[PDB]
Amino acid sequence: TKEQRILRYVQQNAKPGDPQSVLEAIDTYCSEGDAKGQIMDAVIREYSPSLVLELGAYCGYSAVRMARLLQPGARLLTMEINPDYAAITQQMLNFAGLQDKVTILIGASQDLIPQLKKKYDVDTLDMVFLDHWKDRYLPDTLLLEECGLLRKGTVLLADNVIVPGTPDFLAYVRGSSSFECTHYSSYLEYMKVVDGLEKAIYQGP
Ligand SMILES: Cc1nn(C)cc1-c1cc[nH]n1
């Protein structure tokens, strides 16, 4: 119901066609995530990806956040396992006026990623945002590589990466010469990490 409540709140209080007011409505409602969203913004602005893959949609906050910065021609593919969330996310994107920039695929990442080239005509991806299941971060990273979907300069950005969580994913991207890594730790006013993200840029084979 959390995702449903968030949407209705947006629908009642936000301005249609204005992604900023949609995001502000979501943030405001949830607090009584801008640190993470701010990092997502910085990555999109720096790498200027033409095709983005998002793993996990939920209420659509991140789809809105990323798609609003893509220029004409640039697109987002969003995978979401839960059809109820995919519906919420579609409504959220319609509300923000970003529906022409995003395609939502319903299903499990491990099933859909291998079908991207043949079934959905993807060549390579410029950016991947990982925010789905944490036990899939490393397997899906490997799957993307092995399916030939990454190129030199493709940026992976993974949410909710806080040690000792995601030991395998981090061991790989850090450990491998094929990835150049940056970590982000948000503490807000605290001494303990509230959210962590990892940026990993593929260097090619
Ligand atoms: C996409 C996807 N694939 N798998 C395995 C989980 C998801 C997910 C998790 C939250 N939303 N969607």
Domains of the chain, earliest start first: 1-205 (3.40.50.150)
Which method was it determined by? X-ray
Nearest to 180 by CA among 73, 46, 75, 62: 46
How do beta strands 195-202 and 75-80 pair?
A: unpaired
Active-site residue, 41 included: no
Nearest to 59 by CA among 92, 107, 23, 106: 92
Active-site residue, 159 included: yes
Stated resolution in angstroms:
2.1
**C-beta of residue 20 within 8 angstroms of C-beta of residue 100:** no
Tell me the C-alpha to C-alpha distance, in Å, between residue 143 and each of 129, 131, 134. Answer: 14, 16, 15
Q: CA angle, 94 as apex, 88 and 98 as ends, to 5°?
A: 115
14 C-beta neighbours (distance < 10 Å), count: 21
**C-beta of residue 136 within 8 angstroms of C-beta of residue 56:** no
**C-beta of residue 38 within 8 angstroms of C-beta of residue 184:** no
Q: 166: which residues sit within 8 A by CB, 6+ positions away? A: 134, 137, 138, 158, 160, 198
**C-beta of residue 158 within 8 angstroms of C-beta of residue 74:** no
**Cα–Cα distance measured from residue 194 to residue 162, given in angstroms and rounded to the nearest whole number:** 9
55 lines ligand 1 (CB under 6 A): yes
3 lines ligand 1 (CB under 6 A): no
29 lines ligand 1 (CB under 6 A): no
Q: How far is the CA of 62 from the centre of ligand 1 (A)?
A: 14
Nearest to 7 by CA among 66, 61, 70: 61
- Burial environment of residue 31 by CB neighbours within 10 A (0 to 12, 13 to 18, 19 or more): exposed
Catalytic residue selected from 134, 145, 180, 195: 134
Strand order in the sheet with 75-80: 102-106, 75-80, 51-55, 125-130, 150-159, 195-202, 179-186
